[model samples]
Target: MDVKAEVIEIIDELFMEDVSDMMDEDLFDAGVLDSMGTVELIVELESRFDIRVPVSEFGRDDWNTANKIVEGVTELRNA
Candidate 1:
């Protein structure tokens, strides 16, 4: 599936919110996610993508937003 659709699914599944209408850049500031939410996101991504996410990359700057999460996952997939 495409990243956008996957993201929407992730949000709905994790947050129980239909955030498809929201912009990718809005997740963090809009409070769609917080610290614990980020950990869940990382775990979800790692398992879903079969990738090992680094703990060092778990900072807010990298994991705080959906766009950044997509970019990080894309990079991991490409790598």
Candidate 2:
């Protein structure tokens, strides 16, 4: 599956919340994520994608949506 699809699946499964309808919505702004949740997501992304996403390189703005998360991960993988 594509990265975006895989990410959506992971997030949905981890959070037990379907975010398919809010792909472009800010996850934190929409209450889909919080500080602890972001940490969980970082762990999932690193383990699943085998890419290191330094917390320093990430921020609320960089990961505010499913699309941005996909883009950031894709960029990290390529880098």
Candidate 3:
């Protein structure tokens, strides 16, 4: 699946939203997700990719936005 589609699905599932209108460039400031949602996102990324996200990596900048989350997940998968 495409990265954007996967991201939308993940956000929809995480936030329990009917997110059929999410955009890639839209970040947390757009209200696409919340703090708890961010935690769930980290867990989902680790579980889905079977990659270990070090505790140190769990920070605001690492997962503050859709692009960052995608990049972090992609990095873990690549690692």
Candidate 4:
């Protein structure tokens, strides 16, 4: 399976909510995601998927939605 599959798992488990209904919506603007949550997500993604998301390279525009997060993770995992 694709490593990004767990991106949904991480979001659901860490965010404590289902994002299935808003995959393309801005999670931060929707108030479902925050700084701490982003940190947790990054940590989990790196630890679980072997992808490095350096803090200095992180950007909200690229990760503000569930779909975008999956895309970013897929890019990183394949990098």
For every candidate structure, what is the RMSD over all alpha carbons to the true structure, in angstroms? 2.1, 1.3, 3.0, 1.7
A best-first ranking of the candidates according to their TM-score comes to 2, 4, 1, 3
Which stretches in model 2 have alpha-carbon errors above 4 Å? none
Candidate 3: global Cα-lDDT? 0.64
TM-score of each: 0.74, 0.88, 0.63, 0.81
Number of colliding residue pairs in model 2? 0
Residue-wise lDDT of candidate 4 within 1-79, one digit each (tens)? 6655566677778678777655787888888877787887778777888778878866767678788878877676656
- Model 3 / residue 46 / CA error / Å: 1.9
Cα lDDT tens digits for candidate 3, 20-70: 454444456767566666567768866766767777646655566566666
lDDT of 2 by residue, 1-79 (tens): 7878888788877787777765888878778788799889888888888888887766656678888888888888886
lDDT for model 2: 0.81
lDDT of each: 0.70, 0.81, 0.64, 0.75
RMSD (CA, angstroms), candidate 4? 1.7
- Deviation in angstroms for 15 in model 2? 0.8
TM-score of 2: 0.88
Best by TM-score: 2
Q: Name the runs in model 4 displaced over 4 angstroms.
A: none
Looking at model 2, report the run of 10 residues with the lowest lDDT sum.
Answer: 54-63
